[PDB]
Design a protein around this ligand. Structure first.
Ligand SMILES: [Mg+2]
Ligand SMILES: [Mg+2]
Ligand SMILES: [Mg+2]
Ligand SMILES: [Mg+2]
Ligand SMILES: [Mg+2]
Ligand SMILES: [Mg+2]
Ligand SMILES: [Mg+2]
Ligand SMILES: [Mg+2]
Ligand SMILES: [Mg+2]
Ligand SMILES: [Mg+2]
Ligand SMILES: [Mg+2]
Ligand SMILES: [Mg+2]
Ligand SMILES: [Mg+2]
Ligand SMILES: [Mg+2]
Ligand SMILES: [Mg+2]
Ligand SMILES: [Mg+2]
Ligand SMILES: [Mg+2]
Ligand SMILES: [Mg+2]
Ligand SMILES: [Mg+2]
Ligand SMILES: [Mg+2]
Ligand SMILES: [Mg+2]
Ligand SMILES: [Mg+2]
Ligand SMILES: [Mg+2]
Ligand SMILES: [Mg+2]
Ligand SMILES: [Mg+2]
Ligand SMILES: [Mg+2]
Ligand SMILES: [Mg+2]
Ligand SMILES: [Mg+2]
Ligand SMILES: [Mg+2]
Ligand SMILES: [Mg+2]
Ligand SMILES: [Mg+2]
Ligand SMILES: [Mg+2]
Ligand SMILES: [Mg+2]
Ligand SMILES: [Mg+2]
Ligand SMILES: [Mg+2]
Ligand SMILES: [Mg+2]
Ligand SMILES: [Mg+2]
Ligand SMILES: [Mg+2]
Ligand SMILES: [Mg+2]
Ligand SMILES: [Mg+2]
Ligand SMILES: [Mg+2]
Ligand SMILES: [Mg+2]
Ligand SMILES: [Mg+2]
Ligand SMILES: [Mg+2]
Ligand SMILES: [Mg+2]
Ligand SMILES: [Mg+2]
Ligand SMILES: [Mg+2]
Ligand SMILES: [Mg+2]
Ligand SMILES: [Mg+2]
Ligand SMILES: [Mg+2]
Ligand SMILES: [Mg+2]
Ligand SMILES: [Mg+2]
Ligand SMILES: [Mg+2]
Ligand SMILES: [Mg+2]
Ligand SMILES: [Mg+2]
Ligand SMILES: [Mg+2]
Ligand SMILES: [Mg+2]
Ligand SMILES: [Mg+2]
Ligand SMILES: [Mg+2]
Ligand SMILES: [Mg+2]
Ligand SMILES: [Mg+2]
Ligand SMILES: [Mg+2]
Ligand SMILES: [Mg+2]
Ligand SMILES: [Mg+2]
Ligand SMILES: [Mg+2]
Ligand SMILES: [Mg+2]
Ligand SMILES: [Mg+2]
Ligand SMILES: [Mg+2]
Lengths: 119, 70, 97, 155
RNA sequence: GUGGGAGAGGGUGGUGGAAUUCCCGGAGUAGCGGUGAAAUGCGCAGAUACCGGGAGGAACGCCGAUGGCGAAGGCAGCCACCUGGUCCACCCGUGACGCUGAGGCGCGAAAGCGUGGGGAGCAAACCGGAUUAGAUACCCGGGUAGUCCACGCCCUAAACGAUGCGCGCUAGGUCUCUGGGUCUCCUGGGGGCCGAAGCUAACGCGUUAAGCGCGCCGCCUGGGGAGUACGGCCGCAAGGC
RNA sequence: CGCGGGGUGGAGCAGCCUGGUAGCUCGUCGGGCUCAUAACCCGAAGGUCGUCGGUUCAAAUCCGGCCCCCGCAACCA
RNA sequence: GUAAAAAUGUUCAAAA
């Protein structure tokens, strides 16, 4: 319900889908979007094109609250991650900074099987 | 490229307190770098890490921060 | 009805003239190997004579393939001339004739 | 084919308007190797053009063809599983070939009677940007974009 | 004996951050999830994504390796304590005290068993969704023993280098870990590749032998039946010999 | 039997929260097209909105008679 | 480090 100049935008792209959520100087959401939000569904969400429209529709909404300079944090290896960053920069928003903070266990709890496959 | 071992004189690689001295072996995200980029030997790279870790425990050396700009 | 065995695990070819199942029975070669039979069954192209019979020894029965395509046409009792089956879609004898 | 890039056969320019683009159209109009009745009808149509259309029955042809050119088309592509029909750009001479074909078919699909009248009317409409083979182009393009997501499948 | 060396060797105690899940709080809205594509599933009772706080368990990313250690199984964040084996230098001590080893004794992955505790993630069994002719599977969504700790059993394995241990002798070349030193190299222990002579059925082995010899243990004698039956022994049982 | 919530494409079925908007999947038809099948993909028939009536340039909307199926406190000699 | 999905059927000799 506020309107901040500088903000933040998160990228989450799992091989199944890509979600982008725009926050503020603290990380408290302003709006978001992703594959399904756009109009796509199912497999056609992990798709890069999907990611594109998303990041756009994402910031496209952010405009309402007046967003301009916003860092960027990426999480994933999505078969459609770049388009997110791109579509962002190429928007009425200035990609004030791009960082990659994809979580990663320092070898902790056993993973599933589709992943444990590495041993 | 620039070998880490080079850029420094006679240092006590078992000095778990010399920030920069050690601070200059952690890739760009904290990853304790390989000999292929530090240039130490077997017995060195070893005693190095052992000490590099010690420093990480004391808030001196980081654990990881993911380099900026991607 | 059924088999009539004693110490033998296979039915012997009853040679003809006893086989009153079909007309004109007419003897023939020994061409098409046994189901690991030591050889080659007894055939009797026979009524028409554009028709062939090879013998089921385990079975007790002789089975009819056509003269032309060479397609299993039945199994019938040597005793009567009443068939015992359906035509098996899955075997051909004319590669042995 | 497997060896080389085939052979881009060349056309013998029109013998009344002269042009390697007005000739191909006469190939399609042609049935059973009758280059005769082919060309013939093409002009009988141009005549009807003049009739009402006080415009050059040469640009009314160039324009039409232009309005019916598939910018991008959707071509199938079996993937690691089910099959997907990928959207791609149509070769320049591929756009022509098709642009023409549909015109011919879209022509015979009309309720007219004299093949000339048909090949005539269609070309008018096709030039106006709203005909039968036109719908086809407006449509074949709709396919693309619709499957725009499968863009990362360009071969 | 003396003086030093390297190491994930073993046991006890303690400690760090990454991450997963659950709870709490804030912000925010129409989907998330998942596959070959889906569906079941979760979500307007506000999930996914993000931020902050807390609990709890398990494993230790980069270093890290054709790497090291141990008799084997097997061993990996960091820290201290208790403790084993081993390598080099010095030629100082004893003076054949050595090798092997039926039986016996100890150890012995994972799974499994008992008593008690712990339980985040994963996951036999089990329930769903898809696939299929079927699908008591593969793939997906759930999910309990178990995995984790203590004490006591179990005692098997492709427990594999499929190569018993010890001593001597028979070209080197190359790279690697660790020592000693009169540091383009000499010298000792160990880990690899290519390879003399030689052995070999060939494949390949070759100073780490499957080479050349001696000492001692173990085992083989056609495939199947069968590692079964019976007897005996051990085990809570499953089972093991 | 009394309040008072809605009927819509054959069916599932949003607007009425502040009056011009004929919404979409599945299903039906052709196609795209695949191994069959299937998600998908594009065009498309498929709603006088029960209707006598007030309201307006335009009424499904402001709203009256209750026509009917669901909900339906309770009552029932 | 990752091609979804597709089961199954037949049986002899020639050279010196
Ligand atoms: Mg997906
Ligand atoms: Mg280390
Ligand atoms: Mg057989
Ligand atoms: Mg140690
Ligand atoms: Mg401990
Ligand atoms: Mg510990
Ligand atoms: Mg945590
Ligand atoms: Mg749970
Ligand atoms: Mg909450
Ligand atoms: Mg539900
Ligand atoms: Mg609601
Ligand atoms: Mg609500
Ligand atoms: Mg954080
Ligand atoms: Mg948190
Ligand atoms: Mg050994
Ligand atoms: Mg091993
Ligand atoms: Mg020690
Ligand atoms: Mg020691
Ligand atoms: Mg010396
Ligand atoms: Mg001495
Ligand atoms: Mg001496
Ligand atoms: Mg001496
Ligand atoms: Mg003395
Ligand atoms: Mg003496
Ligand atoms: Mg003496
Ligand atoms: Mg014991
Ligand atoms: Mg054990
Ligand atoms: Mg265990
Ligand atoms: Mg237990
Ligand atoms: Mg019990
Ligand atoms: Mg228990
Ligand atoms: Mg639990
Ligand atoms: Mg519990
Ligand atoms: Mg699970
Ligand atoms: Mg399947
Ligand atoms: Mg199947
Ligand atoms: Mg099947
Ligand atoms: Mg199958
Ligand atoms: Mg599962
Ligand atoms: Mg599971
Ligand atoms: Mg059980
Ligand atoms: Mg049990
Ligand atoms: Mg237990
Ligand atoms: Mg044994
Ligand atoms: Mg021995
Ligand atoms: Mg040295
Ligand atoms: Mg050596
Ligand atoms: Mg060596
Ligand atoms: Mg030789
Ligand atoms: Mg030799
Ligand atoms: Mg060799
Ligand atoms: Mg050697
Ligand atoms: Mg050697
Ligand atoms: Mg070796
Ligand atoms: Mg024995
Ligand atoms: Mg025997
Ligand atoms: Mg025997
Ligand atoms: Mg056994
Ligand atoms: Mg017994
Ligand atoms: Mg007993
Ligand atoms: Mg028990
Ligand atoms: Mg027994
Ligand atoms: Mg698959
Ligand atoms: Mg099948
Ligand atoms: Mg079968
Ligand atoms: Mg069968
Ligand atoms: Mg066979
Ligand atoms: Mg001779």
């Amino acid at each position: 319900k506020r309107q901040v100049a500088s903000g933040r935008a998160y990228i989450h792209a799992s091989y199944n889908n890509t979600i982008v959520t725009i926050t503020d100087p603290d990380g408290n959401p302003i709006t978001w979007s992703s594959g399904g939000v756009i109009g796509y569904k199912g497999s056609r969400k992990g798709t890069p094109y999907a990611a594109q429209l998303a990041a756009l529709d994402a910031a496209k909404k952010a405009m309402a609250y007046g967003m301009q300079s916003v860092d960027v944090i990426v999480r994933g290896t999505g078969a459609g991650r770049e388009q997110a960053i791109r579509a962002l920069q190429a928007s009425g928003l200035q990609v004030k900074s791009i960082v990659d903070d994809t979580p990663v266990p320092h070898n902790g709890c056993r993973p599933k099987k589709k992943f444990r496959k590495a041993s | 490229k620039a070998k880490v071992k080079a850029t420094l004189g006679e240092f006590d690689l078992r000095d778990y307190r010399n920030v920069e001295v050690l601070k200059r072996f952690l890739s760009e995200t904290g990853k304790i770098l390989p000999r292929r980029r530090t240039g130490l030997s077997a017995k060195e790279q070893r005693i190095l890490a052992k000490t590099i870790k010690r420093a990480r425990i004391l808030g001196l050396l980081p654990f990881t921060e993911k380099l900026v700009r991607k | 009805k059924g088999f009539k065995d004693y110490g033998h695990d296979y039915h012997p070819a009853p040679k003809t003239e006893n086989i009153k199942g079909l007309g004109d029975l007419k003897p023939g070669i020994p061409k098409t190997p046994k189901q690991n039979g030591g050889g080659k069954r007894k055939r009797w192209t026979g009524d028409k004579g554009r028709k062939i019979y090879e013998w089921d020894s385990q079975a007790g029965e002789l089975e009819g393939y056509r003269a032309s395509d060479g397609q299993h046409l039945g199994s019938f009792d040597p005793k009567t001339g009443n068939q015992l089956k359906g035509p098996d879609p899955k075997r051909n004898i004319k590669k042995y004739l | 084919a497997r060896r080389r890039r085939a052979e881009v056969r060349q056309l013998q320019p029109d013998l009344v308007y002269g042009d390697v683009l007005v000739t191909a159209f006469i190939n399609k109009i042609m049935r059973d190797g009758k280059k005769n009745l082919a060309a013939r009808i093409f002009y009988d149509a141009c005549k009807i053009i003049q009739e009402k259309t006080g415009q050059e029955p040469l640009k009314v042809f160039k324009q039409a063809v232009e309005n019916v050119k598939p910018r991008m088309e959707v071509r199938s592509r079996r993937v690691g599983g089910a099959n997907y029909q990928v959207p791609m750009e149509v070769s320049p001479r591929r756009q022509q070939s098709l642009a023409l074909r549909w015109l011919v078919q879209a022509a015979n699909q009309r309720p007219e009677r004299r093949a000339a009248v048909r090949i005539a009317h269609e070309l008018m409409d096709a030039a106006e940007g709203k005909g039968g083979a036109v719908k086809k182009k407006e449509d074949v393009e709709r396919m693309a974009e619709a499957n725009r997501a499968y863009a990362h499948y360009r071969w």
